[PDB]
Amino acid sequence: SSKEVAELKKQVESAELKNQRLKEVFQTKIQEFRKACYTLTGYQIDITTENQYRLTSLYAEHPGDCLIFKATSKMQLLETEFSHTVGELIEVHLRRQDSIPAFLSSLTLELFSRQTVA
Amino acid sequence: SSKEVAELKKQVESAELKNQRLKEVFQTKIQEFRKACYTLTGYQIDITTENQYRLTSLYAEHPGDCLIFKATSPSGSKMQLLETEFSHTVGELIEVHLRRQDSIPAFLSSLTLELFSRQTVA
Amino acid sequence: QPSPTVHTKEALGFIMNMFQA
Amino acid sequence: QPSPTVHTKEALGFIMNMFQA
């Protein structure tokens, strides 16, 4: 019937509208969430083209300095130009302490100390 | 019944399924990102019902211990620490790093290291 | 306070629930 | 070789967009 045809055409538009909205509010929310995680923790967390996590510090001293972590429950730090400059931090906190959070926290404080003015 | 009604039902079905996959795909990658931020930074960052940000440490002493930050405005980058039961216990860290230094990352870094040292085996 | 349209509220109700754990 | 159904692949095209820079 034209009756059912008209009711269904409206349903299709409604269904498409629900999906379209799901796209827009997701976009805004994660960019809000991404900006919040960056301002709070001090690290830019990017999921790279290999399902890897590349991190950039708010206090990075040179553009391009980054840390790359590989995922498998445990996460392995991979080799980067900046990885070599902090071998000392990696030894204390990643191996002895077995704590990525203690590692990144110590790095942030060290980078913040050298970022200061005057 | 009619082929026109059929074709439209299959479009309704198709859209209500795009739905079901956008949710499930938005479902894993959101958690992927958050659980990654947790494993890496040591903070579980939730969005509260008031669109504020609740942080719980991987090394929290009690499960309800948390910090809550709020964004002052969407068109800005400032953020402010709101009072919680746990924030009552770290007034010295707040004074040094949030008030005198004005660095939330330095604050959470110092708090992470302090909580890590407190969580002894025995 | 125009009110969000039903499609904007429904999507925001589930998207914000996924950010809460 | 499990695959990607069309509705699943279509949601991944918009999903990953906001996880960089």
Residue numbers in the entry:
A (entry chain B): 597 to 668, 673 to 718
B (entry chain A): 597 to 718
C (entry chain D), D (entry chain C): 457 to 477
From the primary publication:
The highest resolution crystal structure, belonging to space group P212121, diffracted to 1.75 Å, with one Mad1CTD‐Bub1CD1 complex per asymmetric unit. In the crystal structure, two Bub1CD1 peptides are bound to the Mad1CTD homodimer. Unexpectedly, the peptide binding interface lies diagonally across the Mad1CTD coiled‐coil, making contacts with both Mad1CTD monomers. The start of the CD1 helix begins with the phosphothreonine residue (pThr461), contacting the coiled‐coil of one monomer at the conserved Mad1 RLK motif, whereas its C‐terminus contacts the opposite Mad1 subunit at the top of the coiled‐coil and its adjoining head domain β‐sheet. Specifically, the phosphate group of pThr461 forms a direct interaction with Mad1 through a charged hydrogen bond with Arg617 of the conserved Mad1 RLK motif. Our structure further reveals that pSer459 does not contact Mad1; instead, it is part of the disordered N‐terminal tail of Bub1CD1. A striking feature of the pThr461 residue is its position at the start of the CD1 helix. Here, the phosphate group caps the N‐terminus of the helix, stabilizing the positively charged helix dipole with its bulky negative charge. In our crystal structure, where Bub1CD1 and Mad1CTD are co‐crystallized at concentrations over 100 times the KD and with a sevenfold molar excess of peptide, we see clear differential occupancy of the peptides in the electron density map and the 2Fo‐Fc omit map. Significantly, the side of the coiled‐coil which angles inwards comprises the binding site of the higher occupancy peptide, whereas the lower, partial occupancy peptide binds to the outside of the bend.
